[PDB]
Design a binder for this molecule. Structure first.
Ligand SMILES: O=C(O)C[C@@H]1CCCN(c2ncnc3nc[nH]c23)C1
Length: 167
């Protein structure tokens, strides 16, 4: 038993809810919140901008130090940093950005990072401003992640569509 509430169960291990991941994160304090990061950890908009804003820019400050030491992430890759006031840890995961021409097949590699964590609160990778089809992101998620993932979908219209079209 864990503290996530109001989720619909899609599979043995994948759950979904219409929620703001920032507000969901501040209430659950999950062990891991996933950020929809880019390779530079420049948290300007979308989920990342919103998560970073909720940390009063502390996420960005920590991220800039990470990049200065380690260089950029790979598309499909991840790093674990602090969760600040939102979670114990933040798993920054880089899904392909269709609006940059990145290969959608890397979406599976991106979701594989979730398997290193027993339980996660996450957005749909490559959705939103990253330009992928969220229905496809949810299919790849279900077919790739084996650990317990709680998906927060900000848009109520999208949430209902994802549920109604799920196979
Ligand atoms: O509806 C969804 O979950 C998908 C969208 C796609 C566009 C970017 N996204 C977001 N952008 C800015 N703030 C957000 N807070 C929660 N999600 C946020 C998520």
């Amino acid at each position: 038993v864990n503290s996530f509430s109001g989720y619909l169960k899609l599979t043995d291990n994948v759950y979904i809810k219409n929620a703001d991941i920032v507000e969901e994160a501040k209430k659950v304090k999950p062990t891991v919140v996933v950020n929809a990061a880019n390779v530079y950890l420049k948290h300007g908009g979308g989920v990342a901008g919103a998560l970073n804003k909720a940390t009063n820019n502390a996420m960005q400050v920590e991220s800039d130090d990470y990049i200065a030491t380690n260089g950029p992430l790979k598309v499909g890759g991840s790093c674990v940093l602090s969760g600040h006031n939102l979670a114990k840890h933040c798993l920054h995961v880089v899904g392909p950005n269709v609006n940059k021409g990145e290969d959608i097949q890397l979406l599976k590699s991106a979701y594989e990072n979730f398997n290193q964590h027993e339980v996660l609160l996450a957005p749909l990778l490559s959705a939103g401003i990253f330009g992928a089809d969220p229905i496809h992101s949810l299919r790849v998620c279900v077919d790739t992640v084996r650990t317990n993932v709680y998906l927060a979908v900000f848009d109520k219209n999208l949430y209902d569509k994802l549920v109604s079209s799920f196979l």
